[PDB]
Design a protein around this nucleic acid. Structure first.
Length: 65
RNA sequence: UUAAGUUAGAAAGGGCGCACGGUGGAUGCCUUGGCACUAGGAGCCGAUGAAGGACGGGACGAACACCGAUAUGCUUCGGG
């Protein structure tokens, strides 16, 4: 997701997305170890998404205080 | 044929010269790095945790470089 969109969702809604993304990464890693992953580029993409979300969250909490 | 005399050549190896190689990195060109200064900046960082490090981060080894569980990068504002 691009920041613009992430910025539209509610904080709670963001947290959920982060949870989901973290599960995708777990699964992706297990597939790689076994030997059933083709798009390995997916791994990096997921990691960066998780970061994008956490950045938005912190920015909102700083703004508050 | 006999006798008495003279000399030559000989290379196991070696010496000198020449021809041709090997080894080894002088010499000549070259510059990625230095040395001495000049004219301006700037002359401190740290308990809101410094200087310096250890350990880690890539699809796939080690190392350098970059980064810190948001880990080979995140957001924004500009350039291109």
């Amino acid at each position: 997701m691009k920041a613009n969109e992430i910025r539209d969702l509610t904080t709670a809604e963001i947290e959920q997305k982060v949870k989901s993304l973290k599960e995708e990464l777990f699964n992706l890693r297990f597939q790689l170890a076994t030997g059933q992953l083709e798009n390995t580029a997916r791994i990096r993409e997921v990691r960066k998404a998780i970061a994008r979300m956490k950045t938005v969250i912190r920015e909102r909490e700083i703004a508050a205080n």
